[PDB]
Each structure stands twice: as structure tokens, then as C-alpha cells.
Design a protein around this ligand. Structure first.
Ligand SMILES: *[C@@H]1O[C@H](CO)[C@@H](O[C@@H]2O[C@H](CO)[C@@H](O[C@@H]3O[C@H](CO)[C@@H](O)[C@H](O)[C@@H]3O)[C@H](O)[C@H]2NC(C)=O)[C@H](O)[C@H]1NC(C)=O
Ligand SMILES: *[C@@H]1O[C@H](CO)[C@@H](O[C@@H]2O[C@H](CO)[C@@H](O[C@@H]3O[C@H](CO)[C@@H](O)[C@H](O)[C@@H]3O)[C@H](O)[C@H]2NC(C)=O)[C@H](O)[C@H]1NC(C)=O
Ligand SMILES: *[C@@H]1O[C@H](CO)[C@@H](O[C@@H]2O[C@H](CO)[C@@H](O[C@@H]3O[C@H](CO)[C@@H](O)[C@H](O)[C@@H]3O)[C@H](O)[C@H]2NC(C)=O)[C@H](O)[C@H]1NC(C)=O
Ligand SMILES: *[C@@H]1O[C@H](CO)[C@@H](O[C@@H]2O[C@H](CO)[C@@H](O[C@@H]3O[C@H](CO)[C@@H](O)[C@H](O)[C@@H]3O)[C@H](O)[C@H]2NC(C)=O)[C@H](O)[C@H]1NC(C)=O
Lengths: 438, 52, 438, 52
């Protein structure tokens, strides 16, 4: 038997489904979304880590001239200085008075801890959801992992379930992403090969292991002081090290809809939005003979106490007459009220009790027990506690019923004015008919 | 502020804590008409006036 | 100095760009897209391979009974038959004549070579384009490989190039793909966990090494024939094997725009669509000062022969007068004609020749040498060869110029008709003016 | 058929080969007006008639 339904994507919300086979007693099955996950699809752009500067020892060559040679190294700087007259601990070497020369050389390279400590830059798109749902009905109770897209069917006790594509297509990750340890940042980084000194991306490499490297940090050499051997240089501080201090904010403390962020893999969890269609295919052993199910006649509903709080704060009593004892699959056909349980043991005493939660001062809903029906309405009073730590267990609908006190009152006033207008129109019509008949 | 949707605060190294607000107010529903306006004023105090 | 232009995405088309700085003689750059590759992003859904059936030896419990035990194997089947009296070569054992039991057991499993012979079911989206391009100007050759999107800048001898995003977003891959060896198919595959026997996806596994499995072949065991030991079973043939011969067509021999598919990784190479915007940044070393550039005066253009064929089939003669001998940059400022060479060796004799390709009956275009300009117009006869084995080298512009023979005739006829109409209007106006002044 | 875009064929076990058509016709361009129409009718014989 095929069936379909829709289910809100709110964690812990005990959604219920009611199925009515014409030859069989109705069934109520309970579904709940224990956990979700929103995997974005990533393609690495590059990696950034703090650089390291190597300076080889100066070549101070005496009594002659020397020439510099270019090399294929990331951000290489080499220069030749004349007239140098160095000194050492014992004395001054380079016997020639002023025909000396110094070769200063310097270049940059990725630091040795870069494999352990670095920040990645991704482009994120096309999120895919996945979830785990607990289902239960009759004597079956299971927790299953399902992809929330229209092509993963999972079997639970002979029943086939398919969870359709999500209602909306909202994702928290921007087009460009920067990941560091266990935090994700909605940022935009400079293009590879065009980094700038002093900011994020002063050095860039396509992958942690890639041999090439593009570094641009303005390494500038200056001539050494008279009588010293020290190779002085000026070179802008680390861009990655600046960014680690001035990144600002995060996503873990800024994402909407109150959904956590986690890394490895990048994912956003428990992120409540939208509706999930469900398609179901059930066997014929799940239901029961209507003959074997008890029959219910003269069904009446009375509400004892109502209080629209977040917890299950209203109590119903159903009175009836039965022929044989058994189990009934109770359900409420409206979302104004949400019931607690899905089965009741019907006994010859003809008195059963149920708990529910609502959010309107005057709710009115039709509740069904096995095959019977009843229409039940209640009056509810506000709750006192201002703040509580558990989520709402009702569907959050507030519009009152037409039979409620406020709407009955407005009905009476509108009826008075309407009858007044009708009387006025009748008087005018009679008078004008007499005038025309004259 | 803790609107009806709720909010989380994260303090030190403790786990973040989430708080939600309930639909409470100060009027009297199911009573006199001048009290029902108070009750539906406490909730949504911006469209009640327009509707009235 | 910055600059921007657009170039067609055709492999082997010799694009020539003109740079005209106010304080220097012009440059001409040349570009050729020697190769492209349009790689989609893939998500593995499942892997299919031919199944294999395990049939354990039967258990004959004689002078007793046995009962069926259930297990958890894919498509597991187990049954018990009663009354068997099996025979062996030495004779008939199980002395008990009638009350015997035979237990039949079977299930399915992935094949031994599923690791080397399998078909992958992918889902593809959000393609990324990669290019390899030869750039040449002044005296530098070189080919670089660039990601074609606004975020990869490559430096080619002191000049920076950025290839912006592609104009059109057409990708030959549909939303679902099946990859087998070296062929790609645009196929809709069944959802995971709902494969039907006898077609593609009769057995389904999440990844080649994952232990779980989902199988539908509908094994049915049968009662063994009297006096024998065989465990007879029946099963629908292999879905993958059937797909192998009934797959039909491919994409390799079907893709539009004439780009060839390759696998590992899956990509589509060398197909023409849209334009690549390219942005440049050149240093001052590339240009030449106008005082060094020779000055060209009184430049005029003539055509010797013109045949609008795919190859370079028109010979152009430029005559001029100069003061010193040197080199100039030659360009044609219209896409109705394309020049073969970008630099010319200018002498004092006052004659140069160039080669151009066109596709219009009466081309008209403005050609420039160093700082001069002139206009060329010609008459081109169609070629004689019906078929050529090389791609066209013109921009494929057909509409003739307005001064050509055809539009000359149109202009003459329209001028005659307009003269007649204006004369009639003047006569009528004069007559009506006389009538009004009467 | 081999239009002005071109086609490739794959015979047996060789490598595929490409062929491109070329702008050829049977009229005489740059002659009389009753011949230029033939020249431009050999090419694109669906808009020339409409234009004339
Ligand atoms: C021991 O000390 C003496 C110091 O006199 C060193 O003699 C030096 O030898 C070099 C050889 O290349 C001379 O350099 C040349 O000088 C000429 C003149 O300027 C110049 O044109 C060449 O291009 C080259 O630079 C240097 O002048 C000379 N010193 C003098 C003459 O005072 C000698 O090399 C030392 N022995 C060693 C280091 O083994
Ligand atoms: C359907 O089956 C699931 C599991 O298969 C049942 O989950 C059960 O949930 C209860 C409470 O939600 C767990 O009891 C808990 O035990 C801990 C032990 O320290 C205790 O601290 C808690 O206060 C609570 O008593 C129970 O272990 C868990 N069953 C498991 C894990 O097997 C679920 O209750 C079933 N549905 C129904 C309607 O019973
Ligand atoms: C050696 O051969 C003798 C030949 O009879 C086997 O005796 C047979 O044993 C089986 C198993 O105990 C008996 O089956 C029983 O039948 C009764 C109904 O009569 C039923 O109530 C029991 O539940 C059981 O199924 C069978 O009757 C008996 N043969 C005769 C003639 O009574 C003996 O088992 C063989 N031993 C070995 C080790 O093979
Ligand atoms: C820039 O570099 C490329 C590649 O280094 C140059 O293309 C090369 O040009 C030479 C001759 O111009 C080619 O050699 C000849 O090629 C023909 C092709 O049919 C072959 O049959 C001959 O036996 C001979 O090998 C060479 O193959 C060609 N290379 C490539 C990859 O096309 C290009 O000429 C350089 N730029 C300039 C302005 O020359």
C-alpha cells in the first residue's frame, strides 16, 4: 500500500502519520529526526602557512670583484657591495685596503611546521543533506541513516521509505570559504598567484605537498655597516600571522537558524529549516483486520484542564462504548493540538485519558479513536513561567477557533450591525416601491 | 533578548546553553472584552492595535 | 599599463590583439588556445559488477529431522524438504526409508573481480574549465596552463595575464552519469536500494571495498528430484551483463560541438563555445619609444588576388615612404579579414606585402602599419575545392561592404526610385500651393 | 553530409578524421545582377529568395 506525507525539519519534533486503509483498521506511525548534516562540496584552492626566511652566510671575497647570478627560487634577492672592509675576532682580514666585495643573498621558503599548522581556502557549493531518523509503529522500532534526496530507499521491517528532496535550498556557506583547525570563515581571498604582502595569502601553494610556491613579501637587502659582517634586510611580517590575530568573528558564532559548525569534513549540523516529503510503501501484515479490531460507538470528548505551555499541558477524557477489548490508534486531525501517544488500550469501562499540547487560547480539533470520530474543543489559560530550557512541542499556531469567546463576541456584534443594515435596506426598498407604484 | 525562537550563550569553556521563551502575557483571556484586548496585546503588540 | 579584450574559444585560431599606448609605438600580441579541458565535479553513488552465487553443500539429516535457520546475507534463501531418499555411487544410505530431511541453502555475493571490472554511477555538476595557451609577442615564446576563471594570474616574462570566466555555461554532461572503462553514458540509473532484477543495478554496493551489499535476483529453490543430490535453484541472469550488450550508443560518438570525452579523470577536451575575456598588465620594457619607431607617411593599400578560402588566400601590397629602416606592427582593425603575420620589416624601397584570409565577396577593412592607416577594398572570387581537411582561419563574416558591386547596384536602383518619388512630391506640392494661393 | 562546421568519422580501428566544407557555389559574383543573385543563392538558399 502506497502513501505519502510531509514532515517538518525540526529536531526532536515527534511527527505522526495516520493511514486509513478502507478494508483495515487505521494505523498511526511515529517519526522523529534525531540528527542532520549538511555537507557542502569543496575543491581546494590553496594553502597558507607562516613563511620562513633563510639567509646563507655572506661571501666576502677579498682583492677582486664578484658577479651575482639569478636563481629560480621563490622571491630571490641577491646583491653585490663594493668597498667593504670586514673585521673578525682576531683582526681584519681581506688584506687589500679597499678592493674587497661582499655578495648578499636571501630568499624565502615555506616553514617546516606548515604541514601541521596551516589554513586552507575552498570554494563551496551544492550542499547535500543527510540525516538519521527513528521510526516506530506497532511492534517495530528502529533508527536508520538516510540521505535526504529523492534516491535512497531504506527498508525497515518490510516497509520501504524514501525521504524526498528538501523543501528549500538555503545554505550557510558563502561562495568562498577559509578553514582553520575547527572554525570556518565566510571570507574572500586574493586569487592564487596575486597575493599581497602583509595580509592573508602572502605565500600560496596549490597543495600541502606541492613543490611550487608563490611568495611575495618585499624582501629588500641593504649594504652592511662599515667593518661588520651581518647581511641586513627588511621584510614585511607574516601575513598569515597577522590574519590569525585579525580574522574577526567566525561562523560558529554567527550562523543563522542556530546550527552548529564542525570541521573534517566541513559540515553544519542540526540546522532547522523547511519540510521533508516522505513516500512510503507498506506490507499488508502491518495493518489489522477491521473485524478483529474493536468497534467504537458513542464517542464523546471532554477536556479537563488546558494551559498553552511548551510542555504537554492539556488533558482529554474520551468516553465510549465498546464490544471487545483491544488497541486503538488515536490521532488528532489538526496541527493546533499535538497528542502524546499513538495507541490506547481500550477496555470495557469506556474511559480513556490522553495528554496534548497546544498554542491557542481556544483550540478545537477532531480526534479519532480506531474508526470513530469526535469533535473536541477547550478553553486554555496562559502559563506563568517566563523562560524554560526545552523547545516548543506544539506546531506554533495561534489563531483561535470560530466558536471561541473572542470570535463569538465579534460574531454577535457583526450580526447585530448586519441585521440593522438589512432592516434599513428593507425599509428603503418598501418606501421606494410605494413611491414608484404611485 | 530571548525571542520565541530562543538563543544560545557560550561562556568560557562550558558547553553552550540554549534558552527559549514561552507565550506568556498579562491580560485575561476568556473574560471581559477589555481584558481580551490586553491578552492579545501582550502577544504581538503591533498588529493587535491595527486589527482593533 | 592595463588592457582587456576577448578571444574566441576555438582551438588553433590565431588571435591577434593590438595595444596602442599614447606615448609609444603600438604592439601586437598573439595568442593560441592549444588545449582545453572541461572537468565536472563528481559524487560517487554506487558501483555495479556481475554477481556470483554461493551454493553450500546440502545437509541431509536422515533418521531424524532438521529445521530451517535464518541468517543475514543478501538474498539469503533457506528451505527444508521432506521424504528424500538420496542415492550415491556405492548405493543408498540413510537406512530410514521415508522419514528423512534435506536442507537447501543459498545466497548471493559480489564477484571475485568486482575490483577490476565494474561500472561507476556518478552525479555531475558545476564544471570547471582548464586551458593551455601559447602567448607570443615581441621576442618571447611560451605556453602556460591557466584555470579559466577570474582567479588565476600567471606571469609570463614580467607581464601578468588573467583569463576571466567563460561566456557560456553549457556542459555536455547531464545530471547523472555512468562511467565504464573509457566510455561515458548519459543515463538515468535506479535509486540506491531499489534495483530491479534483470536490468542495470541488480546488485548495488556503496564503494568497491564496502562490506554491505544490496541484491535483487529472486533466487528460488526447488524440491530436489527423487534419488539425487543436487540443490536445484533458479535465478534471473546478470543485470550488469545484460546492460553490457544493451547499453546503446555512448557519449564519445554523440557529444555536440565536437569535443572528445576522456576518462580518469572524466573530462571533455577541445570544444568551441563562447569567448574568453582576458585582462593584461604589461611592464614598460615591452613597448618601444616613438622616437625609435620609424615614421610612416603616405600609406596606401592594394590587393593583388583575392579568393575567400579557408586558408590564407589574399595577397595585399602596401606602399609608403619612410626615413629609416626598421620593424613595424601590422594590424587589421576589422574581423572581416585576418592577417597572417604581426610584424613587418620596413625598408626604404617603399613596398611590403602581407597575407590575409577572408570569407566575404567584397571585404573592406582598415589596415595600419606603425602609426599610419589605410583602407583596403577588393573583389574576391569563390574557390574551386569543395572540401578541405583543415579548419577555417577566418572569422566567418559574409555580409559584403556597402561599396561593393552588389550594394552599388542596390544603391543605384534605390537612388533612381527616390528621385522619382521626390519629383512627384514636388510637383504635387507646387500644384497644391497654387491652389491654396488662388 | 559535411556542412560548413565540419564532421569527423571513425573507421575501423584508426584514429578519427575531420573534414570541413568550404564556401563554394555555382553563380558568378560581380557580374550582372541576374548572376549575383545566383551566386548568393548557391549560398544560404533560404534568405536570398526572401530578400529579393
Ligand atoms: C696577497 O696580497 C696581494 C696584495 O698586493 C694580492 O695582490 C693582488 O692580486 C690581485 C690579482 O687579481 C690584483 O687584482 C687585480 O688588480 C688590477 C689592478 O687594479 C685589476 O685591474 C684587476 O682587475 C684585478 O682586480 C690586486 O690588485 C693585487 N693587489 C695589489 C696589487 O695591491 C695577492 O693576490 C694576495 N695573494 C693571495 C690572496 O693569495
Ligand atoms: C525504541 O528503541 C530505542 C533504542 O533501540 C529506545 O531508546 C531508549 O531510550 C531510553 C530513554 O530515551 C533509554 O533509557 C535511558 O537509559 C539511561 C542509562 O543511563 C538512563 O540514564 C536514562 O534516564 C534512560 O532511562 C534506553 O537505553 C534506550 N534504549 C536503548 C539504547 O536500547 C526507545 O525507548 C524505544 N522506543 C520506545 C517507545 O520504547
Ligand atoms: C539405525 O537404523 C534404524 C532403523 O529403524 C533407525 O531407527 C529409526 O530411528 C528413527 C529416529 O529415532 C525413528 O524415527 C522415529 O519415529 C517415531 C515414529 O515411529 C517418531 O515418533 C520419532 O519422533 C522418530 O521420528 C524410526 O522410527 C526408527 N526406525 C524404526 C523402524 O522404528 C536408527 O535411528 C538408525 N541409527 C542410526 C545411528 O543411524
Ligand atoms: C614557439 O615554440 C614552438 C614550439 O617550440 C614552435 O613551433 C615549432 O616550429 C618548428 C618550426 O617552425 C616545428 O618544426 C617543424 O615542424 C613541422 C610540422 O609539420 C615538422 O614537420 C618538421 O619536421 C619540423 O619538426 C616544430 O614542430 C614546432 N613545434 C610545435 C610544438 O608546434 C614555434 O615556431 C615557436 N615560435 C616561433 C615564432 O617560431
Amino acid at each position: 500500500y502506497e502513501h505519502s506525507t510531509v514532515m517538518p525539519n525540526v529536531v526532536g519534533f515527534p511527527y505522526k502519520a495516520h493511514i486509513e486503509r478502507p478494508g483495515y483498521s487505521p494505523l498511526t506511525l511515529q517519526m522523529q529526526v534525531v540528527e542532520t548534516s549538511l555537507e557542502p562540496t569543496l575543491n581546494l584552492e590553496y594553502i597558507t602557512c607562516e613563511y620562513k626566511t633563510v639567509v646563507p652566510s655572506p661571501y666576502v671575497k677579498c682583492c677582486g670583484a664578484s658577479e651575482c647570478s639569478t636563481k629560480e627560487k621563490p622571491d630571490y634577492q641577491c646583491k653585490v657591495y663594493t668597498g667593504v672592509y670586514p673585521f673578525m675576532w682576531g683582526g681584519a682580514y681581506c688584506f687589500c685596503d679597499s678592493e674587497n666585495t661582499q655578495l648578499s643573498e636571501a630568499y624565502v621558503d615555506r616553514s617546516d611546521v606548515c604541514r601541521h599548522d596551516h589554513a586552507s581556502a575552498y570554494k563551496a557549493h551544492t550542499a547535500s543533506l543527510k540525516a538519521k531518523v527513528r521510526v516506530m509503529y506497532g511492534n517495530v522500532n528502529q533508527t536508520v541513516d538516510v540521505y535526504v534526496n529523492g534516491d535512497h530507499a531504506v527498508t525497515i521491517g518490510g516497509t520501504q521509505f524514501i525521504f524526498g528532496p528538501l523543501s528549500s535550498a538555503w545554505t550557510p556557506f558563502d561562495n568562498k570559504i577559509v578553514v582553520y583547525k575547527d572554525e570556518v570563515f565566510n571570507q574572500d581571498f586574493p586569487p592564487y598567484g596575486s597575493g599581497q604582502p602583509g595580509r592573508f595569502g602572502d605565500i600560496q601553494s596549490r597543495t600541502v605537498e606541492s613543490n611550487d610556491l608563490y611568495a611575495n613579501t618585499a624582501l629588500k637587502l641593504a649594504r652592511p655597516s662599515p667593518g661588520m659582517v651581518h647581511v641586513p634586510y627588511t621584510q614585511t611580517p607574516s601575513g598569515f600571522k597577522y590574519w590569525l590575530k585579525e580574522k574577526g568573528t567566525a561562523l560558529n558564532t554567527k550562523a543563522p537558524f542556530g546550527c552548529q559548525i564542525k570541521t573534517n569534513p566541513v559540515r553544519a549540523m542540526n540546522c532547522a529549516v523547511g519540510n521533508i516529503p516522505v513516500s512510503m510503501n507498506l506490507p499488508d501484515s502491518a495493518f489489522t483486520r477491521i473485524v478483529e479490531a474493536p468497534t467504537i460507538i458513542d464517542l464523546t470528548c471532554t477536556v479537563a484542564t488546558c494551559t498553552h505551555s511548551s510542555d504537554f499541558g492539556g488533558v482529554l477524557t474520551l468516553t465510549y462504548k465498546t464490544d471487545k477489548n483491544g488497541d486503538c490508534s488515536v490521532h488528532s486531525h489538526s496541527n493546533v493540538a499535538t497528542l502524546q501517544e499513538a495507541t490506547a488500550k481500550v477496555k470495557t469501562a469506556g474511559k480513556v485519558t490522553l495528554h496534548f499540547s497546544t498554542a491557542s487560547a481556544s483550540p478545537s480539533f477532531v480526534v479519532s479513536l480506531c474508526s470513530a470520530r469526535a469533535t473536541c474543543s477547550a478553553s486554555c489559560e496562559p502559563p506563568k513561567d517566563h523562560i524554560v530550557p526545552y523547545a516548543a512541542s506544539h506546531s506554533n499556531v495561534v489563531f483561535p477557533d470560530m466558536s471561541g469567546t473572542a470570535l463569538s463576541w465579534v460574531q454577535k456584534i457583526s450580526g447585530g450591525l448586519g441585521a440593522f443594515a438589512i432592516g434599513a435596506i428593507l425599509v428603503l426598498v418598501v418606501v421606494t416601491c410605494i413611491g414608484l407604484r404611485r | 533578548p530571548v525571542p520565541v525562537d530562543g538563543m544560545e550563550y557560550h561562556w568560557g569553556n562550558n558547553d553552550p546553553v540554549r534558552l527559549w521563551s514561552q507565550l506568556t502575557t498579562e491580560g485575561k483571556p476568556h473574560g471581559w472584552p477589555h481584558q481580551i484586548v490586553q491578552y492579545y496585546y501582550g502577544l504581538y503588540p503591533a498588529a493587535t492595535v491595527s486589527a482593533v
